[PDB]
Design a protein around this nucleic acid. Sequence first.
DNA 1: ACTTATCCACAAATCCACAGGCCC
DNA 2: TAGTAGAAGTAATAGTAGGGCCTGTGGATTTGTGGATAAGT
Lengths: 334, 335, 334
Amino acid sequence: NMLNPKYTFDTFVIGSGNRFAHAASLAVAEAPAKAYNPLFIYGGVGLGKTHLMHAIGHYVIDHNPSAKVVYLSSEKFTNEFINSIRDNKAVDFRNRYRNVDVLLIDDIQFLAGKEQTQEEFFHTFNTLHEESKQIVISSDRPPKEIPTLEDRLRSRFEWGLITDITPPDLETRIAILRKKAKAEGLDIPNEVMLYIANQIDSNIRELEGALIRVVAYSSLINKDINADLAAEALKDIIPKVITIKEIQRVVGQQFNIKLEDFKAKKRTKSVAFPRQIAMYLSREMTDSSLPKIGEEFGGRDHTTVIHAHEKISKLLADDEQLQQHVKEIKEQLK
Amino acid sequence: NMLNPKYTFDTFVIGSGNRFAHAASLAVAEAPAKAYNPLFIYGGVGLGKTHLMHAIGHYVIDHNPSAKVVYLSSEKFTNEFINSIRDNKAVDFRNRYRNVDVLLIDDIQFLAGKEQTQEEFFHTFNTLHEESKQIVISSDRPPKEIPTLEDRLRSRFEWGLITDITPPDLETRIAILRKKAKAEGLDIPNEVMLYIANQIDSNIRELEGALIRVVAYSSLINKDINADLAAEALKDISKPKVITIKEIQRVVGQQFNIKLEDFKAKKRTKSVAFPRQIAMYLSREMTDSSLPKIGEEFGGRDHTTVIHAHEKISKLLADDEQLQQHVKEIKEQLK
Amino acid sequence: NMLNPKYTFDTFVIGSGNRFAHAASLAVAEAPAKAYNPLFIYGGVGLGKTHLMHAIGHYVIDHNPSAKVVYLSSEKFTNEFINSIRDNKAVDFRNRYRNVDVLLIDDIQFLAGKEQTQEEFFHTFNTLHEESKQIVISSDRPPKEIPTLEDRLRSRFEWGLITDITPPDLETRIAILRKKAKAEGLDIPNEVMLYIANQIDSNIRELEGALIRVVAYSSLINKDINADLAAEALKDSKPKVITIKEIQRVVGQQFNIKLEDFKAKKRTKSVAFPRQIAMYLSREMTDSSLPKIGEEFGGRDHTTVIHAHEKISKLLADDEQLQQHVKEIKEQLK
DNA sequence: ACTTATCCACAAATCCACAGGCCC
DNA sequence: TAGTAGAAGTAATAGTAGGGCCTGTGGATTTGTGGATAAGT
Ligand SMILES: Nc1ncnc2c1ncn2[C@@H]1O[C@H](COP(=O)(O)OP(=O)(O)OP(=O)(O)O)[C@@H](O)[C@H]1O
Ligand SMILES: Nc1ncnc2c1ncn2[C@@H]1O[C@H](COP(=O)(O)OP(=O)(O)OP(=O)(O)O)[C@@H](O)[C@H]1O
Ligand SMILES: Nc1ncnc2c1ncn2[C@@H]1O[C@H](COP(=O)(O)OP(=O)(O)OP(=O)(O)O)[C@@H](O)[C@H]1O
Ligand SMILES: [Mg+2]
Ligand SMILES: [Mg+2]
Ligand SMILES: [Mg+2]
């Protein structure tokens, strides 16, 4: 059907960032339409939302062959809705999508900006919840911050349980890697898994891609996977914390001035202008507080910091090659 | 069909710079949607990405006549998408591009700056991957550095297997010359191909152009192909070593027996300044960096000092054949 | 149509400096899209490139009346492309220029700098090449020295065969003056033949212009053509085009500075004063654009030329010597 | 003690993306 | 057996990439010019 055999509760590795979502989803799977009817789950990219939805559908269909579970995306929903109302066959669209025992609608944020598709989904939600049919909704952002969503639809989103998924930590990253390797059926040393999980922490997808690249490169070189071969396979794939000290050093380097005279009390232009540019960069790049940066600037007052920042912003608002130099400095810092 | 009969896995030549991509493409063509469902090949220009895409298409079509293999470039995708939007046949566009066993989309970087087409390709990718359909994506730079690409699409690109093509080796350039000569069915002595391969190193396209020009000039003059005729034909036709300041000061320090760190020292002695003055001269002569940067590389020395040293060295070499010879030797060493 | 019938494969003669291009073009005409599919003819002005392109078009259309052969200059291509974008007829533009059997594009050099049209020409090239169509391109310089040409388009240009056109020699001039004499059906003495052959060598357009002048003089004088009449006709009535190269070479002759260093980034006063003088003179007596002057002089900005002209005007508004020298050089170049 | 080579402040020729007005 | 004259109809999408440049101030910026300064002789 429309579900994924690889996406099930057994393949899901439970961790700190997905324990709550997993438990809520498992409750919904065990007691459809009776425990948490409007379930809403949101998170980042490559975190397990569609995996969890397919696991819910798999569990319900496995335990209840007389269950009409339908998984779909928001894009497919709008496509089918508009096609139906263009073909003048809307009655069949309604008949299909109001009689589902479980509705697993995905990436609901796509509905933002489509007023009539939002209205049709609103009526679909009302009809499905009025008859005790399970509703699971997935998003990338909490329902509050989905734009162009009406109060009615948002309030239906918020009626039941709302969960969240957080990026995974090291232990569960290594656990996911071990599970994927064991499912594939190859023995990989634990040092390789630790190496990969350390040097790629973005989501499942780049982690899986790194594992696939390691395996493919090792198979090509017909050598057993080790830490050095994994390093060579991931040489071409592999952010830094910005530091006020590093910013000052860089700016002083470009603008022909030493390091010890940043805290000097000299008011010469040739030193003040690079210092003002460096402090403007620190203000508009780092989250460091104004008292802290002033302390790093030899105890300069917040009023003086304000005046220098405003002067630099206004002066840059009239020219472009200072912006070019700032862009070059930022590229160097990256 | 839309595929090239010239591009095939047979006509492709395995080199050290493309063995990985050839193996990945061959495995994908042997087992579509079952080995590496999203496959992402990136590299330089004229390096053999469309060759591999057409080769995969040919293999899949030949080994499965009933499979729908569709090859297109990014600009064709955008043109057809926008045309469908204007003509209200977007349903036809979706039904055409969401129901293919194998999709082969070329030069995906062109989508940078096309937000609606990026969304449409995102959804097409999602549908094809859900339905266990093979997707092959081509580009010149990895998805990390394609600008204005949504993180969802980037994460999809990074999901499967990403492989790269690197510029060809001398041996494989000679092999490509041999293969092309055999394909067009005339014989060329080995030294001519060796000369062409040594002289031309950018990508396959310039190599093919050089071979075509040599063959055509030989046919025109009605004389047999040799090294002198090849040179005459190619009269007007493995890396550009970009200079760097650390290299130039390393060369001058090895020439005049001064350590690296002392280059940033404040000493004003003659035996220190004169190498530094000629370093200023050669830096301004060769590199495109500003005199602010030339003062950066010596720990913040003034552009005025740099230019004063420059004109001093110019005046010196105006009457110093020994200095001219030394600077020429420095140029030869750095080149 | 758009093809000049004066140029045809019959009236072109195998010269010493153009036999290679003639043979390549003839092979292309005999076997379109099969022999040398991307054809690239680079050479000086008035040497036979347009003649060869028109001959190729004539041959292909004659031996295949159903073939779609289109010839155009790059100016027309750019203008049509821009107007298609402006009027939202870009679909019609693409339909016109991607479904032709043979395309003959003229003067590809000045596309240098005009971006977004060398991407549409890139896509047109790729469409024609993949659909097994024929492309002929004309230029005044080898592709490796066409400025601001993206590496992909450069590789596309160099993928094919490159033909060098050399200025004609004595025998070629003699042959084509015989050709024009047979074309226009008048008889001239061998003395005038040799005269016009050997004492006139800039380009064959100049040769034809001298022919026209001699014919007009003979018709006006109502006397038989002879060496004395030819010499009297060619003693000197033409407004010379004030070119940037002429201006800069006059400036260099007057100031003792070479020409190649004008491309150098060096901007000492002794060479910057002649540079800004040349910029002001070009702005004064050239209809050419300041960005074109900058590109011919190192790819500099138009605002640079504007500032140089403003500074020169300010200087001449105060110093009489500068005005006198400017008047002297203007009279010299006039 | 002075003058000479060297480093730094300062002003001007130059070059950048950027506002605008055609006008197609 | 040879058979008549039939009306009043809805609520509806999501939607693209794009042209140089003729001009033209504003302002950085990257230097040369001049001045300030240590030293060494
Ligand atoms: N905890 C986990 N354990 C195992 N696999 C996981 C886990 N979290 C995510 N994954 C992997 O995520 C992959 C795909 O991610 P998924 O589609 O579930 O997330 P998503 O990007 O949030 O979803 P969506 O498609 O709704 O945008 C699956 O193949 C699955 O193996
Ligand atoms: N081993 C090889 N690798 C690459 N190209 C080869 C090889 N052997 C022959 N060629 C020829 O050299 C040309 C270079 O490949 P290709 O044209 O695909 O470069 P590309 O820049 O990747 O193409 P595109 O720009 O369309 O992506 C091909 O047209 C091909 O016919
Ligand atoms: N080598 C030549 N021999 C004889 N005639 C020539 C030669 N070159 C140019 N001509 C004459 O010039 C005319 C047009 O060709 P020409 O070389 O002027 O094209 P062109 O200058 O390249 O034009 P464009 O710059 O528009 O491409 C022809 O009618 C031809 O008589
Ligand atoms: Mg989702
Ligand atoms: Mg490609
Ligand atoms: Mg021309």
